[PDB]
Write a protein that binds this ligand. Structure first.
Ligand SMILES: NC(=O)C1=CN([C@@H]2O[C@H](COP(=O)(O)OP(=O)(O)OC[C@H]3O[C@@H](n4cnc5c(N)ncnc54)[C@H](O)[C@@H]3O)[C@@H](O)[C@H]2O)C=CC1
Ligand SMILES: NC(=O)C1=CN([C@@H]2O[C@H](COP(=O)(O)OP(=O)(O)OC[C@H]3O[C@@H](n4cnc5c(N)ncnc54)[C@H](O)[C@@H]3O)[C@@H](O)[C@H]2O)C=CC1
Ligand SMILES: NC(=O)C1=CN([C@@H]2O[C@H](COP(=O)(O)OP(=O)(O)OC[C@H]3O[C@@H](n4cnc5c(N)ncnc54)[C@H](O)[C@@H]3O)[C@@H](O)[C@H]2O)C=CC1
Ligand SMILES: NC(=O)C1=CN([C@@H]2O[C@H](COP(=O)(O)OP(=O)(O)OC[C@H]3O[C@@H](n4cnc5c(N)ncnc54)[C@H](O)[C@@H]3O)[C@@H](O)[C@H]2O)C=CC1
Ligand SMILES: O=C1O[C@@H](CO)[C@H](O)[C@@H](O)[C@@H]1O
Ligand SMILES: O=C1O[C@@H](CO)[C@H](O)[C@@H](O)[C@@H]1O
Ligand SMILES: O=C1O[C@@H](CO)[C@H](O)[C@@H](O)[C@@H]1O
Lengths: 362, 366, 366, 367
């Protein structure tokens, strides 16, 4: 049974807590033991440790990583703390489940990538949109030749949370803006579908410059939206965007792969639907709405009946299981810190391209 | 902490187990203790006890309901076992979380309802489609006057799990040990939603059909005795009209519990295959007039306990976590759970009334 | 060239004018001669005859039907005038394109049906929702065996043009001079579609409601006599089941004629608000299993006459050009026009039987 | 009444013929006189003149354009003939309704633009997707401040009419004789819509591909010389960002001209495959918050001329009736026709500028 440390209890902290709690319920084997939860202040950590089922809560994150009963550390803190916490966890001999993006800079991710190799421990980064049954089904369909050769990718990730204060808005805590917060997710899906990125040309904007209800000066330090044209190492084209100010959208990570023999389209706001076009007889020709069910990777561990909608949080249960199987030497987790470094190079290259008005080659 | 016993480990058993496991994570308080898991054969129970995180497994459900470390019993076994297991649990002084429908007949349900009344323990029935944030938001919107007075309800629940005529016959397709067909599997869920939106059913007029009448049975065929599909017109106690259907042979549908409430000042529409969307129409200025797509997020009941970010789709299994919490709070004396065995008996009467109406070609009043 | 008379210039009158104008553009042959347009008052008739391309306008419908240069008469006037105008046109030896419903009563429709048989002239009724490429494709798909045998129909027709309670009372809301309500305006259309997919209706059980019972009337108010909404359970002659509804007070809906046919081997579903989409489910291998969205294009009946490329949305008004062509062909002695007054009389019996069932609380058998 | 000449009878020729027939039916006034139809061969012209309701057919387009009974000429021929036919019509003193794109090159379009300005006759180009009630309603909503200030545009135009590699070659797929590929066929439409919503384009950075490089040609094989798809990042004169694409090989799409304008106070979204729907988000109370589906009806520009009841779907062909009416009004001096040949030349510059950017790997400024 894997011993678990959890650092942070917010959006992702609670998501990881629920995932670790049910990974064996869904996939079998032994239930992970919830050992230590870290958060500030201490009374909050004690409270959440009690309700989450952790053996203790502490205000000292170092206390979580150094617990001998811990085998794996979930890190769900602001981006500015990822590098320090992940390097400490790896040095401590712990496997690491790190939230995206890796850190603030390419240099940070490079140091982390080197630390991971030196430690001989497993790493996985929290790119949970790669875990839906629909997404995994799409990957397999492409590999099987269902849409022929990919000839164009178009992807977006729109939300509007910033169009209504967060550490996400600072360079010391968040790093990049929309690119770092949402863009990296789109990259994780995009490269899994299309292969590695060879070239980007990008542009960006900040639409809301100051948080109007903060009272004191509250300068937004990073971008609200960005777009890029892509060339993949295959030579194929892509379109790419992200935004945290696109009003009306809440989790609109949407993508499509146009192939020579068909098209696949997906929208995370309806994460249980995968749209597949393949040529057919004229009288019955059109896109198929594939509703998520037990034929798709991972779904049958949660439900034997199709159409009982798989949830956002259940992607994290799948993610936990992939890390669990990697730790046992039964599969390879993706992306590890090496695969993740490439993703960081992409989003940071997009940022560079937007700043300079020049294409960036990889 | 609440001591939990779980009977069965299938579709609903595993769903209940996931719910009990995460209920305090989502909603606070103390994590329930997973004491005893019951299933057959013994090896299976031992294995699933280990992976589900229950202190022990047993092949003897009676031991499970009798354990002094157990306070509440989740009953997820087949319909023909509900009555026996629930009456035993209640007689052992345990609260009960019972899967739908209550049993095979109204008479069984009445008998269980009588047992529950004399028990002074809390009961809840597994009508999980009433727990989605979208459904709960819709109920609140109607109470707040968002659509004015309801003037018509239209609901359906289509699935195709029995559509293939080569699927083998079973005792579940007999009236005796299977009870109702589509009305029992799906109809009861639609009633649970419908009465929550519209109030009590006063009258039904129904029709029903067995579409695939004979199915393969070791070498030859055997007759299917209960209905593949049913439809009904409704009058509510308010006088308001309704349409109602269910089907287990409706090809292409997987979990299409879909409903609509039309009112004097607007319309609400929902489809469970897209459980994170609620469609609301209210009159607006001509230039911007039209239905709104309300995407599930923390403004809707229960959602914020699972995720702070709107549009991160709430799942089918998370409905069961909400249901666990409602029972948990009822056990603590901090709110009534719905539907209890009394509320559930009325639902049983409605579905069996529809079957009676369909057999007679006559309306049935309640 | 066919000589055309047109009576009325409103919603359908202008629709018919546009149809007759482009029917040969789309389908070939000789453009019909637009000879006489009748409307009132006379100034409107003269102005519209000029802009519609008619040789002359008149305020006297009887003059239009008797003109020796006329072969066919479009009748798009209010329901109370249908019987008289159709009988006069037929007596004058003209073919008739009559707007739905046939008349205000079954009695009137029976007289019209006898008159049409007595004349040796073609008749067609304006059930234009049967003319879409999507609908005609659906019929052909079922005729190819695409969904096996139909086992259930579910149809609705929702609109909200009377939902506003301050809309004034009129004689159209009385039984005597208005006939049916929502069943007469909308229900007849749903029946036309329904029987085209499922065959003849054997029995109905219906309910109905006047939701807005009183409306402004010259300073005070007056009572609405006919129904704002109705619903019915259908038993088809084939033995199969159906659900049916209509409403003129269903807020947010504008032309929601929506139907589905569930079959033994698939399902077809359609919504007129998206008239260029037809949803087809057929069983498929599990990896790719699901409904197909069929977007209207040249593979569907009639579409290629208007556009060679798919996805260029076919319009509501182009249904009428198709309807005109079906009549032209029937007059020429090629195709048959459906529904003629005999086919139409049956539709009238069904909708009036629904109204009777709702009033009496009893099923009505055909 | 306006006298009409029609050149060509294909996809657009028949569409124009249907539009001219019903323009007065929808909008009033005098029905145009359908005088001369030109098409080849002569038998076909005579046959279609009859069924389309034109007084006569000819195989000599030059004769049709100089007929003194003709006031306006619809030109629906292939792109390589537009320049010659439009210049001759204008020189004969006729108004012109020209199909898109203008011609093969920017130089051709500059020639046509000069000819129109010299003729003092009205011109309109067939950008019919700017005529839908939904699109026109969207422009009005933006002008009224319904979504605040635009902060982003994302538009696409996907179809699959060339996605099948077995579909035969044509001279359309050469540079010399067909011009641009998807940019010319579809991109121009997307630009017409885009600039109407966002204003003029200041900069493009683009890329393009030929996906099917060869096609069957009467027993042999021939190379496809123009692009099957293209994408571009845009900066508008406003400073606002844009994404743009087109494709003739995007499998499963038939007329997927789809766009959205994201603003400071809301979002508008549209897809031509459901041309009767306009999606509008404006901030609302959290309990009811979300995009509205606005179904096309008489509150939207032009719809009421075709139908008095909402939700009776307006069709593709009816866009062309609206286009005809705009040209009639312009000819009568009671309205502006957009885009005329001057407006059209800007559209040509954008699409050819995208083509240039894709070839050079460098951004192209227009300012
Ligand atoms: N994969 C995905 O879908 C998502 C990923 N994320 C990522 O997860 C991470 C966390 O984001 P949220 O949960 O949204 O942030 P949050 O603000 O909701 O939570 C941050 C947590 O870290 C805790 N914390 C901060 N400093 C700490 C310290 N020194 N020691 C211990 N605990 C500390 C906070 O008290 C809080 O519990 C970020 O890296 C973010 O990019 C966030 C949301 C979704
Ligand atoms: N609320 C919902 O959405 C759903 C509810 N259900 C309900 O779940 C229940 C189970 O459904 P079935 O299809 O019958 O499932 P099933 O045939 O899989 O049986 C359920 C479980 O009961 C166990 N079991 C059977 N006999 C037992 C015994 N004597 N002692 C202990 N365990 C025993 C089985 O091994 C299995 O683990 C039914 O009441 C059904 O209506 C089912 C699916 C969804
Ligand atoms: N098939 C379809 O989709 C539709 C059918 N209809 C049908 O169209 C018909 C007309 O609809 P209403 O609402 O009554 O429209 P309405 O009240 O606009 O009248 C229709 C036309 O008849 C003219 N008219 C009335 N009395 C006349 C007379 N004595 N002589 C000559 N012209 C006369 C009117 O001026 C008007 O142009 C009805 O039968 C109705 O059911 C209406 C809308 C859609
Ligand atoms: N606005 C829009 O949505 C659309 C515009 N178009 C445009 O319409 C134009 C034509 O395309 P289609 O209609 O698809 O082409 P098509 O090839 O279907 O039709 C060409 C027409 O021109 C005729 N023609 C050719 N040479 C001629 C000559 N020398 N004299 C007289 N007639 C001649 C042909 O016989 C045929 O009638 C192109 O410019 C194209 O870009 C095409 C489709 C849609
Ligand atoms: O209660 C249920 O019964 C199953 C049929 O046994 C259906 O598949 C479920 O979707 C439904 O919730
Ligand atoms: O026949 C009809 O009647 C009108 C109501 O009078 C509706 O608005 C139309 O949609 C319908 O086709
Ligand atoms: O201008 C157009 O070109 C055609 C291709 O030539 C497309 O099929 C049409 O949808 C488009 O409007």
């Amino acid at each position: 049974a894997l011993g678990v440390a959890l650092i942070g209890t917010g959006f992702m902290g609670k998501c990881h807590a629920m995932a670790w709690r049910n990974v064996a319920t869904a996939f079998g084997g032994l239930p992970p033991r919830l050992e230590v939860l870290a958060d500030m202040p201490a009374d909050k950590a004690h409270s959440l440790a009690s309700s989450f089922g952790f053996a203790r809560g502490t205000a000292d994150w170092r206390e979580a990583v150094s617990d001998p009963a811990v085998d794996v550390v979930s890190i769900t803190t602001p981006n500015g703390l990822h590098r320090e916490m992940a390097e400490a966890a790896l040095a401590a001999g712990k496997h690491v489940w790190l939230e995206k993006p890796m850190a603030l800079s390419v240099e940070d991710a490079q140091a982390m990538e080197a630390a991971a190799r030196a430690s001989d421990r497993r790493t996985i980064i929290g790119y949970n949109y790669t875990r839906s049954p629909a997404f995994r089904a799409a990957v397999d369909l492409i590999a099987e030749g269902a849409i022929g050769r990919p000839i164009h990718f178009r992807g977006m990730y729109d939300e509007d949370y910033m169009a209504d204060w967060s550490w996400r808005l600072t360079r010391k805590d968040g790093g990049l803006g929309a690119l770092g917060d949402l863009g990296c997710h789109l990259v994780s899906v995009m490269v899994s579908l299309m292969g590695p990125v060879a070239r980007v040309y990008a542009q960006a904007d900040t639409v809301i410059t100051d948080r109007p209800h903060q009272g004191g000066t509250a300068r937004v330090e990073n971008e609200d939206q960005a777009q890029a044209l892509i060339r993949f190492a295959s030579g194929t084209s892509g379109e790419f965007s992200c935004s945290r100010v696109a009003r009306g959208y809440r989790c609109r990570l949407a993508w499509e792969v146009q192939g020579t023999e068909g098209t696949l389209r997906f929208d995370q706001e309806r994460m249980n639907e995968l749209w597949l076009y393949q040529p057919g007889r004229p009288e019955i020709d059109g896109f198929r709405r594939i509703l998520t069910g037990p034929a798709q990777p991972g779904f049958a561990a949660f439900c034997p009946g199709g159409g009982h909608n798989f949830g956002f949080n259940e992607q994290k249960v799948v993610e936990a299981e992939m890390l669990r199987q990697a730790i046992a030497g039964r599969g390879k987790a993706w992306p590890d810190f090496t695969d993740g470094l490439t993703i960081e190079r992409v989003i940071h290259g997009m940022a560079t391209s937007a700043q300079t008005g020049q294409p960036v080659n990889f």
